[PDB]
Design a protein around this ligand. Sequence first.
Ligand SMILES: CC#Cc1cncc(-c2cccc([C@@]3(C4CC4)NC(=N)N(C)C3=O)c2)c1
Length: 390
Amino acid sequence: GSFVEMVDNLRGKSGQGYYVEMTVGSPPQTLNILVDTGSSNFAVGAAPHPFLHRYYQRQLSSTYRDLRKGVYVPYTQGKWEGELGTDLVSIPHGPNVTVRANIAAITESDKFFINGSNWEGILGLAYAEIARPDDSLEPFFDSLVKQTHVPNLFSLQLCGAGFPLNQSEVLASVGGSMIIGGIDHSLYTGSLWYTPIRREWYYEVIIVRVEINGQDLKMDCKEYNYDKSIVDSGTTNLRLPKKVFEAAVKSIKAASSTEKFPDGFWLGEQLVCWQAGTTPWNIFPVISLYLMGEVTNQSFRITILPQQYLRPVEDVATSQDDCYKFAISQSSTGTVMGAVIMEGFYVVFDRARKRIGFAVSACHVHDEFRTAAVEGPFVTLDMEDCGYNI
Ligand SMILES: CC#Cc1cncc(-c2cccc([C@@]3(C4CC4)NC(=N)N(C)C3=O)c2)c1
């Protein structure tokens, strides 16, 4: 590892998000910021909120610049309004540089901040195309690269603990690493395999084949990327398009048929519990996603275990049982490779070479019988036809 200063700079968990410490303004105001590859705005709480114990105070920053423009950002579940400005921004456990970046100062919000998440803002790491209000609002990473000598690349190691972390534990635990400008070899084992970034807006990729315990889901590959497939550190679940979700759940049910689970479990609503240490990992299948390779007609696969897709949760009765929720769910907006995928792998967002790399994570949870994997190459034809077009 050549980036010791950035290794282990993340905290949090899949259910509430992984965050990095940043500073905004002069003198520096410390805030915890959600690492989000699924959006492109740097937006921070800038007014009192019940779930915030701190926020950005523009009046206390001598370097604050008012852009005299508001922003209204409505999501599916949650929304926020803010005021656009610029200020000096740094990442203490990051590159040793300070940059002037756009900041959306959140003045009003609904279901945006998460009680107990320990973060006060979001760092949208995707491209300008999806920035709000429009693509003229330069994203943080674009500003960072343009103003410094930091290489146009970052890499994420999200570390699921494999068990529930209480309030105190989640604050004292290392949640992972965000390496700005490089690849740290201590965060992964084996080889890195790269898939092309199809288009620069979200981190869009193309899935060419899906298997459940080596059994091909056998769907037209276009279904897997309908209407897009993205890598999103800001989503908890592995989200699948409706038809893909229906086919995958049927196959996961069939593979795990020695034990029957209620519909609410498969719906990701209800947890399932087993006596301490008896989780029957072996009855649940592995899931492989084949991604388009960098070489013509070549693909590779990333394989996750139930230790990635079964999210550890504390039992309602805080008993000694090991409990989980099913962390694969349906989407009407394409595939979303969220923390379920990301926790299995070290993920390299190689913007300079328009590609995303995957390698087995040094912090993925597994058992003595199975491990997550990144393998290749495979001969795969007409992979371009797997990509969806409106
Ligand atoms: C892993 C993880 C996580 C996580 C947990 N709880 C809330 C959030 C959380 C909180 C606020 C906004 C967001 C968003 C919006 C677009 C900016 N980021 C994102 N990629 N997605 C799909 C969102 O809805 C996520 C993330």
